[PDB]
Amino acid sequence: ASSFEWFGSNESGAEFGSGNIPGVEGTDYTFPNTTAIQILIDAGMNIFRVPFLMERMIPTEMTGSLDTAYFEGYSEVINYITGKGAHAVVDPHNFGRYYGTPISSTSDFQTFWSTLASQFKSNDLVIFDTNNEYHDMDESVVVALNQAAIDGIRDAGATTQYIFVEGNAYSGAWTWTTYNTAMVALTDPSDLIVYEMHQYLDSDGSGTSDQCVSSTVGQERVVDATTWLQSNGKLGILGEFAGGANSVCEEAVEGMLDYLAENSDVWLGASWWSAGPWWQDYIYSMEPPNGIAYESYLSILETYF
Numbered sequence: 169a170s171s172f173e174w175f176g177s178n179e180s181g182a183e184f185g186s187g188n189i190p191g192v193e194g195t196d197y198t199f200p201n202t203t204a205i206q207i208l209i210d211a212g213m214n215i216f217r218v219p220f221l222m223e224r225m226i227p228t229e230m231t232g233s234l235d236t237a238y239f240e241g242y243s244e245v246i247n248y249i250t251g252k253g254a255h256a257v258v259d260p261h262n263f264g265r266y267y268g269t270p271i272s273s274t275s276d277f278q279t280f281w282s283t284l285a286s287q288f289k290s291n292d293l294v295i296f297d298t299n300n301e302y303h304d305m306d307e308s309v310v311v312a313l314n315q316a317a318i319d320g321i322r323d324a325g326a327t328t329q330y331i332f333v334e335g336n337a338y339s340g341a342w343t344w345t346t347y348n349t350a351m352v353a354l355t356d357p358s359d360l361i362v363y364e365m366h367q368y369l370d371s372d373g374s375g376t377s378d379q380c381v382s383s384t385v386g387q388e389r390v391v392d393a394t395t396w397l398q399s400n401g402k403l404g405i406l407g408e409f410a411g412g413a414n415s416v417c418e419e420a421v422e423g424m425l426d427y428l429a430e431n432s433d434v435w436l437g438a439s440w441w442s443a444g445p446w447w448q449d450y451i452y453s454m455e456p457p458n459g460i461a462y463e464s465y466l467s468i469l470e471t472y473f
């Protein structure tokens with residue numbers, strides 16, 4: 169059948185216009201298009217990661233109540249995905265920050281996650297992602313926040329769902345052993361932790377350029393993370409990756425995924441960045457019918473599922 173347990177795409181829109189909070193749906197942000205998601209499901213994709221903003225989901229304080237309107241729009245997309253049998257990743261796309269300030273309260277963060285996870289606790293196709301790309305924070309705080317999120321999710325009775333944890337330094341695969349070895353200490357009573365890493369192929373790994381360093385830089389940038397997963401008996405998932413519409417990037421993406429698939433005993437899969445209805449001519453857009461990456465990469469990616 170497939171190279172991985174999971175292979176799919178990010179579905180972007182609800183995290184857009186982050187300078188406008190709460191902002192206005194249809195003006196500053198939008199929710200993903202379930203008809204466009206269905207096209208990717210029909211192509212074989214079975215996981216979709218859906219960014220949102222913490223401040224739009226639970227405004228004012230992390231310990232507060234949900235914004236009903238934003239939660240209902242967001243959960244309609246989540247429930248469409250799981251209703252079709254695919255896994256849906258709930259991603260607070262917040263960089264370890266709440267209203268621009270680094271999160272430093274494990275107890276506040278745990279409460280945020282109990283409030284949110286309580287709304288999905290009976291849906292075993294939901295996956296929780298503690299936060300997108302912690303960075304420029306103390307490593308012990310990042311590990312503690314991941315643990316606080318796990319604690320809040322399980323305490324809320326959401327015990328059947330995988331939890332994607334993310335490291336410091338933008339959770340990059342290529343720097344994982346440099347910054348994030350202390351993430352090994354995370355515990356989960358359900359034993360469903362997956363280490364979510366991101367890997368881009370431009371010079372700074374930021375994923376802002378359609379040019380890759382070389383045709384082999386992808387494989388080179390995931391070797392150490394793979395060794396770490398295998399050495400420590402952990403599982404991983406490449407929750408973001410992309411490359412530009414050129415042969416060097418396509419071969420780099422292929423070589424990276426080939427290596428992950430060769431090591432599928434620890435790599436559970438990968439999800440492209442990104443699809444969604446508001447990307448226009450984005451260098452990495454996986455949105456049908458005409459996204460640049462949909463045109464250039466979809467048939468390459470279908471090799472793996």
Ligand SMILES: *[C@@H]1O[C@H](CO)[C@@H](O[C@@H]2O[C@H](CO)[C@@H](O)[C@H](O)[C@H]2NC(C)=O)[C@H](O)[C@H]1NC(C)=O
Nearest residue numbers: 200201202203204205207444445446455456457
């Ligand atoms: C959601 O995605 C669907 C599928 O791509 C979009 O539907 C296309 O819409 C155009 C214009 O309305 C039609 O001419 C096509 O026939 C549709 N294609 C398919 C395969 O149904 C739809 O416009 C998107 N909705 C948004 C972006 O709000």
